[PDB]
Design a binder for this molecule. Structure first.
Ligand SMILES: [Co+2]
Lengths: 129, 370
RNA sequence: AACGCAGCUAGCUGCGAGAAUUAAUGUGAAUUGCAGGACACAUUGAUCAUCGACACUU
RNA sequence: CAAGUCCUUCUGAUCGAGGCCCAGCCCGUGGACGGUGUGAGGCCGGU
RNA sequence: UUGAAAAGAACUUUGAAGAGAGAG
């Protein structure tokens, strides 16, 4: 049960902010869980998705064991693109299939200056508890 | 019959005063007849008889292809990084003019020499004042053509200096050769697209620590050549899912093939330089004296063949790109601006012109180089 | 209230000749219909938000 | 700033249906809500 | 208020097309 008087639980209100959200906010909902190996080593459960991360699909028709890299983070449609997540168009070309970030697992992170700082900040909050 | 000098200057006809010019690679048509081979027309039946009925037409293609071979060997001889392609194009054009001994429209250059760099694919030639020095880490597509009495031959290759591109070059060359062997008489164009895509995609490219997958440029495709008509109206594709039209006896084709480490599509990027009068349009009124003058100049000097702004400045005409775009809007001439891929991508092209002889398939543009 | 401002732009929206935004701060790799442009991301920066500096046609 | 995308099974996809040593999967000062290819405390934002 | 996702119907054939018949 939520006790904060200034946070609403209204269905329409919550939906409106989710569908009408600025991109920098949308990145926060653009979050995916790390695999067990990153989670144990980084002590972090979930991370926002990025343009180049090794990503594994765990739900849907394309669910499998193969590892792929994100190639586009389409924040407008709340989807991302991996290489081998494709289907065959009618004429003959090949198009990507949008997969929601919550339905994938990050197997390798785009280790970067801002990134490296992000994990240790989340991780150091764990030893607080 | 004399011999050619070390810097090629002797006209091809002088090398073969007899009139017969070296034949291309003769190849039997594919055994696509459900296993049955086509090695039944090589016998000198009426097939060969009606082949002889068009012998004089072939000889023009043979001499044009020989001239192309000597010109491209000469270009390969001295091409090196650090020199701009304005002088490269000048050297190629003047050597081709001397070797073909152009005279009006009976002989000359079929279209401007294309030299596309890096992500650019085709239909780029430097204009006046274009200061672009070549680099060691560059790839260039040398596409140029010559014709004899309108018998156009179109051939293209790719030059590299950094040895990191040989994988892509060999992939595109294999794709082009597979398209060559797959082509034949009474075969659908979708089949050749199938073959080209299934051979070319099974290659991997490792450039600068990044692994890319080579893919066809689905936008470009081959074409059929006509009498003074570079594009006869038939396009052989290089991707799956195309038309079901057949190739017939007595036709000639340019089996082009493009491969890019990019998105596989191209768009117009920089200033247009290639232009082409429409073969089908008839008489369209013009209201500008300058436009009329330029139109009659180009139809006298370039006819229906493609031309570039360098070829117009070479003729002493200035202040003309205005009337040029005027003819473009009037629909007389169609601009062909350069086609380019994503920045940082690389493109390779290999092209050959093939002949559908009644008895066999001759790739007249074949040479020892490629 | 009027009139203008987008590479392709009529309406809606935002903006004011610095005209679908400038600066600064936070954030931290996109925007997206297409193309182009980007993008060491600290020898410091896309987008978004905030908004205290600047500017704001009749 | 907590904890299942564990196993078997329904599906086009599932958040669905069974099971989860110790009387009972794991967290619970968190079982409000929303999103995610049904219906989700434990996938994600949050709470 | 299509559809989870345009995957918005390649290609062949009749018609000048709108419209069909196959196919996907
Ligand atoms: Co060509």
């Amino acid at each position: 049960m939520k006790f904060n008087p200034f946070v609403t639980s209204d269905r329409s209100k919550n939906r409106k902010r989710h569908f009408n959200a600025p991109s920098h906010i949308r990145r926060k909902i653009m979050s995916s869980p790390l695999s067990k190996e990153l989670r144990q080593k980084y002590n972090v459960r979930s991370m926002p998705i990025r343009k180049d991360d090794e990503v594994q699909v765990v739900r849907g028709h394309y669910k499998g064991q193969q590892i792929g890299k994100v190639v586009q983070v389409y924040r407008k449609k709340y989807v991302i693109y991996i290489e081998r997540v494709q289907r065959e168009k009618a004429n003959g070309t090949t198009v990507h299939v949008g997969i929601h970030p919550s339905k994938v697992v990050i197997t390798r992170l785009k280790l970067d200056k801002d990134r490296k700082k992000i994990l240790e900040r989340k991780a150091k909050s764990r030893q607080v508890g | 019959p004399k011999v050619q000098t070390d810097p090629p200057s002797v006209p091809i006809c002088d090398l073969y005063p007899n009139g017969v010019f070296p034949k291309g690679q003769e190849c039997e048509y594919p055994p696509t007849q459900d296993g049955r081979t086509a090695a039944w027309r090589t016998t000198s039946e009426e097939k060969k008889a009606l082949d002889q009925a068009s012998e004089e037409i072939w000889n023009d293609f043979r001499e044009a292809a020989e001239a192309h071979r000597q010109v491209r060997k000469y270009v390969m001889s001295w091409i090196k990084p650090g020199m701009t392609m304005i002088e490269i194009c000048e050297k190629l054009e003047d050597c081709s003019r001397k070797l073909i001994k152009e005279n009006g429209l009976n002989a000359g250059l079929a279209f401007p020499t294309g030299c596309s760099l890096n992500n650019c694919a085709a239909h780029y030639t430097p204009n006046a004042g274009d200061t672009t020095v070549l680099q060691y880490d560059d790839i260039c597509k040398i596409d140029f053509g010559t014709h004899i009495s309108g018998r156009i031959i179109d051939c293209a290759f790719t030059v590299t200096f950094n040895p990191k591109y040989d994988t892509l070059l060999k992939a595109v060359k294999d794709a082009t050769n597979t398209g060559i062997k797959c082509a034949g008489i009474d075969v659908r164009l979708c089949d050749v697209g199938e073959a080209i895509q299934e051979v070319m995609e099974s290659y991997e490219v490792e450039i600068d620590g990044k692994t890319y997958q080579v893919k066809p440029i689905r936008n470009l495709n081959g074409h059929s050549i006509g009498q003074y008509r570079i594009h006869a109206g038939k396009t052989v594709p290089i991707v799956k899912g195309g038309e079901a039209t057949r190739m017939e006896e007595g036709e000639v084709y340019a089996i082009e093939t493009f491969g890019s480490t990019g998105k596989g599509v191209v768009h117009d990027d920089m200033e247009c330089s290639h232009y082409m009068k429409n073969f089908d349009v008839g008489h369209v009124p013009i209201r500008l004296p300058r436009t009329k003058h330029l139109l009659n100049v180009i139809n006298e000097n370039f006819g229906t063949l493609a031309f570039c702004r360098r070829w117009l400045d070479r003729l002493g005409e200035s202040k003309y790109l205005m009337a040029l775009k005027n003819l473009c809007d009037l629909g007389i001439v169609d601009p062909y601006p350069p086609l380019c891929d994503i920045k940082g991508s690389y493109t390779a092209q290999f092209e050959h012109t093939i002949l559908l002889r009644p008895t066999c398939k001759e790739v007249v543009s074949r040479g020892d180089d490629y």
